[PDB]
């Protein structure tokens, strides 16, 4: 039948890509990094503690000013903190009570939230009466929302559990382009610092590089053995790292199109929930379900001080744009800022 | 000049914590419930007893708040959004009493989940009358789906409603003990199940939920004091 020949030529394409990539691999990145000098131990304690949430924390996002951060909890509340004064700023109630994601505008004028309601809500913070109200609600996703990332003041990229990623358009309420390439629930995504390309990881153990300009799958990155729950870019923009539930963290290069290093350890067994990089890229962070976060190095596996300050499962974390300090989130409704 | 921003954020903080404690008083006094069922399980009747990806129904029973959440419009993938329900009071399970083995496999997965441990399960065996008539005529009996049904016997603690078929008591207790075999296996003393016998006309299912929720909170309070 036609399904047989289409499947057969599909496998032949997988082979010729793999053979071309295998011929492309000349020297593992571990070999070229054999002459580098390890940084050592950068063990550091927490600086600030943030309290005020009722239920577990699922997501957070940092601000461009590297001072404002917003988190979401199952109680139906959005809280924008102050990393310096520790004093809360805004308290946004939610119509639903099962939010599973959060975001932050590049200019600080917008936030995002989504969950089991299958509707992404955009809240405008710079209103005219000094209060907070929802600006636009986006409906059309069949499944729950899992990750949102603002590209600019007009368009937003949201990933839902309907196996499709969408590029919405505020002030219109309709989708512009849809990325129907995944065969599993999409968990997290991140955008490169050029508002042109972004990668998205789903529950099909594959991270796909999309293009918002044409709405097609530019490249596909594989290597993980379980569902991908975290993803982040290298500061240069030509590389990105992922994180799955198999206690493995891998580094991918947009030009190599294959895994380079696996930042895994035999002691860690729980899955990763959130990853991030440093300003210079000479570091690596990855959350875990064993109540603490590990610190690595991009050039080679160099275990630094473990950021162990949480009681429940770590579900979200981030790094400031200036790279001065980092933040972490956990299900104990507690947020800490490590520097 | 810089202190005014501080007192502004402090005043903004207190007015935020005031509303947080205001909503905490109703959040701690609300017993959220997860209404879960299978395809054509008859769970709509429970909703009517008193698009969007989830439904809500706020009903009070003797100054007690119960919040049921119905999963509507979500795909069959449950391994990701079932983790959000690790803080509810109980997960109401609806079965269409092979459409029965899948309910047992879904109950087993929820029971043995790593986050959904510590949450109890309220089981409702709906379609009790429809199942009773079909086993009475004998056109489609459940031995094809359960070969051990012949070797099963009526429990000593059976309470058959008078006039119920000698066969319906065998059927309702067999399905009841099927879920008990799963709950008692992984049960370490943190969450229990309360199977019930729900018909298509009985309106006392709301009273059953109140009694099970009372047992859940009582066992939780006993566990905090290490008494039980």
């Amino acid at each position, epitope marked *: 039948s036609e399904l047989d020949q289409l499947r057969q030529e599909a496998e032949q394409l*997988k082979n010729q890509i793999r053979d071309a990539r295998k011929a492309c691999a000349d020297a593992t990145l571990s070999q070229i990094t054999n002459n580098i000098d390890p940084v050592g131990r950068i063990q550091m304690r927490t600086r600030r503690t943030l309290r005020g949430h009722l239920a577990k924390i699922y997501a957070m996002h940092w601000g461009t000013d590297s001072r404002l951060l917003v988190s979401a909890s199952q109680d139906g509340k959005l809280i924008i903190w102050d990393s310096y004064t520790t004093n809360k700023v805004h308290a946004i109630p939610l119509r639903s009570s099962w939010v599973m994601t959060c975001a932050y505008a590049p200019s600080g004028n917008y936030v995002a939230c989504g969950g089991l309601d299958n509707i992404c809500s955009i809240y405008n913070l710079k209103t005219r009466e000094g209060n907070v109200r929802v600006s636009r609600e986006l409906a059309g996703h069949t499944g729950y929302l899992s990750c949102c990332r603002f590209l600019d003041d007009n368009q937003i990229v949201t990933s839902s559990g309907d*196996t499709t990623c969408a590029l919405w358009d505020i002030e219109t309420g309709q989708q512009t382009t849809t990325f129907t390439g995944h*065969t*599993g629930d999409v968990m997290s995504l991140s955008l490169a610092p050029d508002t042109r390309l972004f990668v998205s990881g*789903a*529950c*099909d*153990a594959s991270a796909k590089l999309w293009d918002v300009r044409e709405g097609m799958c530019r490249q596909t990155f*594989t290597g993980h*053995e*379980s*569902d991908i729950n975290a993803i982040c870019f290298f500061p240069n923009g030509n590389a990105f790292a992922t994180g799955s*539930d*198999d206690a493995t963290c891998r580094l991918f290069d947009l030009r190599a199109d294959q895994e380079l290093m696996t930042y895994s350890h035999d002691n860690i*067994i729980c*899955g990763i929930t959130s990853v991030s990089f440093s300003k210079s890229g000479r570091l690596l962070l990855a959350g875990y379900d064993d109540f603490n976060c590990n610190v690595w190095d991009a050039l080679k596996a160099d275990r630094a001080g473990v950021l162990a300050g949480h009681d429940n499962r770590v579900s979200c974390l981030g790094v400031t744009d200036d790279g001065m300090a980092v933040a972490t989130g956990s299900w104990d409704s507690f947020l800490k800022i490590w520097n | 000049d810089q202190r005014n921003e501080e007192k502004a954020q402090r005043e903004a903080n207190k007015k935020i914590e005031k509303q947080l404690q205001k909503d905490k008083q109703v959040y701690r006094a609300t017993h959220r419930l997860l209404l879960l069922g299978a395809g054509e399980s008859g769970k709509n009747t429970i909703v009517k007893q008193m698009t969007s990806g989830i439904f809500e129904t706020k009903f009070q029973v003797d100054k007690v708040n119960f919040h049921m959440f119905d999963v509507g419009a979500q*795909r*069959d*993938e*449950r*391994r990701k959004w*079932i983790q959000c329900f690790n803080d509810v009071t109980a997960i109401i399970f609806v079965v269409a009493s*092979n459409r029965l*083995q*899948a309910a047992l*496999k879904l109950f*087993d*997965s*929820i*029971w*043995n*989940n*790593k986050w959904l441990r510590d949450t109890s399960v309220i089981l409702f065996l709906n379609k009790q009358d429809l199942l009773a008539e079909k086993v009475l005529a004998g056109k489609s009996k459940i031995e*094809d*789906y*359960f*070969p*051990e049904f012949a070797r099963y016997t009526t429990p000593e603690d059976a309470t058959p409603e008078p006039g119920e078929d000698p066969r319906v008591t065998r059927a309702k207790y067999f399905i009841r003990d099927e879920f008990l075999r799963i709950s008692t296996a*992984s049960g370490d003393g943190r969450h229990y199940c309360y199977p019930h016998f729900t018909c298509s006309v009985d309106t006392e299912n709301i009273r059953r939920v109140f009694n099970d929720c009372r047992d859940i909170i009582q066992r939780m309070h006993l566990r905090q004091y290490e008494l039980l």
Partner: nanobody
Amino acid sequence: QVQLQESGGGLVQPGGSLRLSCAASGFTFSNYKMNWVRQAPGKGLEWVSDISQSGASISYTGSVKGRFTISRDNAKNTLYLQMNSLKPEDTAVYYCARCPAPFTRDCFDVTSTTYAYRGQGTQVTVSS
């Protein structure tokens, strides 16, 4: 690359035993709980069997608990499902599924209509 391919199957006479395979690659075969599902024509997916990591926890569907027999080989990274005396009720394509989260006693979404960690269907037609 996570991929599962199954073998065996075909037209079998009633009362004839048949065996199936499930070759797994791209991951650790020993650190996952593998399961089976069936898709009867004009019906939905139905769970058939499963097996734990080592092989201690093994369950089968009540509909055919006795005749079916499952086994796995962690060293060779291949799993085998043995079926004896096939009945007309078993004329369904069998898909090799794979539980996503490792080191878990539970397993969600085994019989979902659309699943990533699940191979193709091996047709097993039971007819005269």
